[PDB]
Amino acid sequence: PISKKRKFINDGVFQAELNEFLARILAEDGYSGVEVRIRELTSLVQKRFFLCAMAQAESLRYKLLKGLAVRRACYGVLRHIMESGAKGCEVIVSGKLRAQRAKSMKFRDGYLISTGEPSKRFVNTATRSAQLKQGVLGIKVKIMLPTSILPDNISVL
Amino acid sequence: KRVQTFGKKKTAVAVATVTNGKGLIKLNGKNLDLVEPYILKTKVYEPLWLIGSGKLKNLDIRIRVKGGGQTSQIYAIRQAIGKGIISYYQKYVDESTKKELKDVLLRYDRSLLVGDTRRCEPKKFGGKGARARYQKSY
Amino acid sequence: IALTSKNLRAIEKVCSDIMKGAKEKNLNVSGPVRLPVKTLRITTRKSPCGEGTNTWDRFELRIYKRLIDLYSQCEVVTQMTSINIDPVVEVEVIITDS
Amino acid sequence: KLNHAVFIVITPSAIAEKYKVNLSVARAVINHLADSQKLYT
Amino acid sequence: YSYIPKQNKKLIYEYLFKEGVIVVEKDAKIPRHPHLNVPNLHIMMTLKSLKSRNYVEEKYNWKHQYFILNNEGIEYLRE
Amino acid sequence: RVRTKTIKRAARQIVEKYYAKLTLDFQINKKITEEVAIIPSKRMKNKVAGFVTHLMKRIQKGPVRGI
Amino acid sequence: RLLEPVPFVKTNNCIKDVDADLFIRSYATHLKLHNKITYPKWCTFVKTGKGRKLAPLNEDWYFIRASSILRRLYLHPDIGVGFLRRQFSSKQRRGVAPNHTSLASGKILRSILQQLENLGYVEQNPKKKGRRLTTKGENAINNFARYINKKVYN
Amino acid sequence: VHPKKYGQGSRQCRVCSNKHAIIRKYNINICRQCFRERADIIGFKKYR
RNA sequence: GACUCAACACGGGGAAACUCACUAGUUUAAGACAUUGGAUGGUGAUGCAUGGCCGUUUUUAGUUCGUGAAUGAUUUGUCUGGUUAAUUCCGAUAACGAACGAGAUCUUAACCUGCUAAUUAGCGGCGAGUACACUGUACUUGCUGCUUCUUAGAGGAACAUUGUGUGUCUAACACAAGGAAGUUUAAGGCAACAACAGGUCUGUGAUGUCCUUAGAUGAACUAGGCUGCACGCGUGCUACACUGAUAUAUAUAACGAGUAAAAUAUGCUUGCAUACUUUUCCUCCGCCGAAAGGCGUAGGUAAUCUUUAUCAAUAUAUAUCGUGAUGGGGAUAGAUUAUUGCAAUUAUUAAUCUUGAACGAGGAAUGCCUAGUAAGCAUGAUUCAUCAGAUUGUGCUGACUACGUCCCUGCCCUUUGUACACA
Ligand SMILES: [Mg+2]
Ligand SMILES: [Mg+2]
Ligand SMILES: [Mg+2]
Ligand SMILES: [Mg+2]
Ligand SMILES: [Mg+2]
Ligand SMILES: [Mg+2]
Ligand SMILES: [Mg+2]
Ligand SMILES: [Mg+2]
Ligand SMILES: [Mg+2]
Ligand SMILES: [Mg+2]
Ligand SMILES: [Zn+2]
């Protein structure tokens, strides 16, 4: 017997844990999922228990690990996003990056709403920290998805 | 026969059941003789005085109060009475009389019919109260 | 029947569906009664450090408990419950005479 | 200073003013006359 | 403690084989593993050893250790 | 208490297309707006209606400088 | 003192239609007259609750307390000792640290209750919860209230 | 070994084993910074 | 660690141990893998190596692009003016047109549907009584149309609507009526661009390098210290009384929050082993106890029980004081009785008795605030084994004064000057 409040929190915690586990495991995957080769994963979960932004971020991280010219990679990513039908994007990469000191680099394409509950709704955001030569490079990707309609527009027929 | 309306001041909902009867007027299980403090007693009696004590010999009234402090409760009770009597008149007595009563109430003041919409604003961090921040010495 | 959940609209939809199911036949269904939403509030202080004018942030996980009654046999109620449904809305059926 | 005593238009303050007395004594006097704020004539 | 009985070790290995994976819990003074009542420290040590040889692959999440068995490891377990 | 370009723009758009439907009556105007344009809010919609009404008032007594 | 021109009639039937403090006083007086309830031993040098840091200063405070308790019982269905204590709570100034609310010394209350039950005014109900009024006691209380009302009218 | 059962050093964050600043309400047992990051996934939305 | 705003009840930091990084010492391998190489751990070093997150610039209104126009950096757009809470609009115009920011959106709180629903909420309905009124009222047990109150989903309602002023009679403002409401209704949340060499590696198994690695700066244990005190500066609490203390009596909140250790029996030498079951958190209630608390039991994994048709204090009413460092004031101290915990001394906290200090409204300075606000009064929660004087919510009593201005202070703008650009 466990109370409702207690249960809910516990469930949330479990969800979080699962997510983290997935992140740890699947560096080679276009990960989003969270709905329940894979046999091992299932076993692990049992033991424990008794277009998208995250994927893009992961891809970026992988690219960084591989060792590209950075800017080019970012551009490619942006292009991909555009192809996948995004109204707007934004990527940031801050960290060490070539020089020792500082250096945050923005990469926007289409328009990116930041403030309001629309932002909360109509953007998928993701954050990965790609470990590299002499520290960490800091990805953050932010995608504005196709709307189910924005509050700013007033479409007269 | 029997009519149920509420008052409302802050939190403090006084629900006035106004029925056919002899003219007693009560609170939960107690007469309006009590209320509590002698000073504020007039704020409860005022609508009755305005309307006339003979008009309420046809109407019994019970009032159930819940929530709030003292003064707020009194106000709520008053409001309930004001809404109550008028509501009764609108249904089971004539319209002209009701109108007259309403006019009288308006002449005296607001708050009897229409409600006080004020309520305790949320306290904000960096302070004790709503607006009152802490203190900087530099 | 008690329907505990986190997401309001979804819960409402579920309730509606069950009502519809009931209205088929044989079910004296009392209307959906939504219960007092006992909101889990956490007030955490933002900022890992102690720097910056200490802004807090009131999170609220607001659980919606929903309740609904019936005079029926178990199998039928089970069938009714089967609207497919998903991991989000937590259902519990009580099959008591009292 | 004003060390008022005990052994020897009505209000306590007035009484205090007049005969130079503690206000408990004033109260007592008032009571006697009759026989948390006050008013008497 | 630094005892490490042989029989216990063997049992652990068998369990691993049966599963394919072991969720360790990276806790020092927790007595037992959920299923098998073994001193957890010993189990942890064994898993570390396995990892060192690359018989097992590890992906550390919060608190738990989540060890997954490698093909070489499996082969070894054949014994 | 002034109107943004979005509101103003919307108003402009109406009276170009749907001047026929409209008359100096607020409720009617609001209804028309609801029928025509995709305002997600209530308050915003109301505001839009009000501005349309104002625009209408301004015309009949002269040119607006738009539409 | 209390009386005034009101716009209604008062059904002076039960104690809820009586002014409290006066009623309590009257009841205390009645008790004194009777000699129906004692004044144990420790009563005459105890403090009624943590917060009071001082003795009552009323002489026949016990009687008053008893009267109050009776009224409380009448008001509520089933009322414990804890509840009673809570009811007779005050602010405890902790000198320099700010005030807290202070639960009353329950022992005296308990004793009073016991006395009442012995006399046949209150009743530990096996159904429900702790000690309500006994019907005879209630009736007596009502009678007293009526008497008080009559006196006031006079 | 000395009693590690009731005190700040008894239990810890689930996430990063830190003994400081643990949200111990509703048996969450996450140190508050970590909670702040995972408040989305747990289902704690800021409204007001 | 943090040092003007933007360090100083801050690190959720109320540390008896653990926390613990420190001091006096003592253990241990948690030394994988091929005594050696080689990792592994660090509340070690460095936030001037970084990630993320947070702060401030700034909740102000600001940032940018397309094309056009004006060797270059650039400018224009993005403005003389009016208006706005707002680069909010209007109007003028080498610009026209966009996009983010504002606004909208979200969440509450504000008033309705006398439509949607009725428990774990009520209202009645009605039996059963107990008291008293007149020819119904107050109060409990037992049974089961309405939705005003109680809960909470979807809708509605204000748009400056109608009226009248001021305004290029433009954007808009002021007043009046209506109305639940007329300062985007009130309150938040969200938070552009660009930074600051701001903070944080003492939140992290986010993380680089350098150090350390068994006489460890790893972990574990035993004390001790973070609380030590001529003093300076913070944030608070309590006061200086009579609109008050004291003591009785009466009144009445809202947000809440609540589940490895012990008991009893058997077998042997206070210990172990075996068997078996309530207790670990909220406490009703019944008894003991001045008090604190204790013991027994009861409900509650919660709109059901704690408990909430009342858990609080200011309130109010009636008494004692009587302006006297006074019964204002409760510091400092002295001695017990408990509770928490393995452990309470450098007194955890609590209670009981006694001790009766400074303070008679506060100098130079400086903070916060415009309506349910200030202030007062409490109280829930967070920390929590125990401990609010903190924070964070919530309510209750409910002022004064504006309703503006640029005088100071701080930001922003145009012009202007600059030898500054680390500004
Ligand atoms: Mg926007
Ligand atoms: Mg302490
Ligand atoms: Mg220590
Ligand atoms: Mg820095
Ligand atoms: Mg420009
Ligand atoms: Mg906004
Ligand atoms: Mg310290
Ligand atoms: Mg604190
Ligand atoms: Mg200043
Ligand atoms: Mg220069
Ligand atoms: Zn953590």
PDB file of C-alpha atoms in Angstrom, chain A residues 16-29 31-32 34 41 54 58 61 127-128, chain E residues 59-61:
ATOM      1  CA  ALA A  16      13.436   9.913 -15.377  1.00  0.00           C
ATOM      2  CA  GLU A  17      15.677   6.983 -14.484  1.00  0.00           C
ATOM      3  CA  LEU A  18      14.546   5.091 -17.579  1.00  0.00           C
ATOM      4  CA  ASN A  19      15.292   8.113 -19.753  1.00  0.00           C
ATOM      5  CA  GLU A  20      18.759   8.449 -18.255  1.00  0.00           C
ATOM      6  CA  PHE A  21      19.418   4.734 -18.789  1.00  0.00           C
ATOM      7  CA  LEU A  22      18.371   5.027 -22.429  1.00  0.00           C
ATOM      8  CA  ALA A  23      20.672   8.017 -22.891  1.00  0.00           C
ATOM      9  CA  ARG A  24      23.558   6.076 -21.358  1.00  0.00           C
ATOM     10  CA  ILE A  25      22.940   3.055 -23.579  1.00  0.00           C
ATOM     11  CA  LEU A  26      21.984   4.501 -26.941  1.00  0.00           C
ATOM     12  CA  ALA A  27      24.783   6.774 -28.168  1.00  0.00           C
ATOM     13  CA  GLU A  28      24.374   5.035 -31.579  1.00  0.00           C
ATOM     14  CA  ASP A  29      20.580   5.654 -31.918  1.00  0.00           C
ATOM     15  CA  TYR A  31      16.532   8.149 -29.386  1.00  0.00           C
ATOM     16  CA  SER A  32      13.181   9.581 -28.197  1.00  0.00           C
ATOM     17  CA  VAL A  34       9.998   5.975 -23.739  1.00  0.00           C
ATOM     18  CA  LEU A  41      17.558  -3.947 -22.064  1.00  0.00           C
ATOM     19  CA  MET A  54      17.098  14.979 -28.987  1.00  0.00           C
ATOM     20  CA  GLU A  58      22.808  13.087 -30.480  1.00  0.00           C
ATOM     21  CA  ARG A  61      27.505  14.961 -30.647  1.00  0.00           C
ATOM     22  CA  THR A 127      21.072  19.521 -24.524  1.00  0.00           C
ATOM     23  CA  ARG A 128      24.146  17.251 -24.861  1.00  0.00           C
TER      24      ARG A 128
ATOM     25  CA  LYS E  59      26.999   1.725 -18.870  1.00  0.00           C
ATOM     26  CA  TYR E  60      26.751   3.599 -15.553  1.00  0.00           C
ATOM     27  CA  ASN E  61      23.407   5.247 -14.721  1.00  0.00           C
TER      28      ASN E  61
END
